[PDB]
């Protein structure tokens, strides 16, 4: 029951890590898009 709770919390933290990676990817899209705009528009 103690080990079960630890595994739960470990997955929960892994999931927070993945959520941070998902926001980082959203911003990488923004960064790439802006470089192509700068090279295309401006």
């Amino acid at each position: 029951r103690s080990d079960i709770e630890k595994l739960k919390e470990a997955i929960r933290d892994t999931n927070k890590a993945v959520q941070s990676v998902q926001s980082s990817i959203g911003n990488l899209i923004v960064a790439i898009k802006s470089v192509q705009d700068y090279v295309n528009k401006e």
């Binding site: 080990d3 630890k6 595994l7 919390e9 470990a10 997955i11 933290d13 892994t14 927070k16 890590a17 993945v18 941070s20 990676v21 926001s23 980082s24 911003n27 990488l28 923004v30 960064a31 802006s34 470089v35 700068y38």
Partner: protein, 33 residues
Amino acid sequence: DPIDISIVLNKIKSQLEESKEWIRRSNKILDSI
């Protein structure tokens, strides 16, 4: 502008460092099993 891309990259670096701290905690919990 390029200086205002730098902001976006800094945002990415900040989220990446949060992600690393979360994995660090998960592994520390697993060490205790």
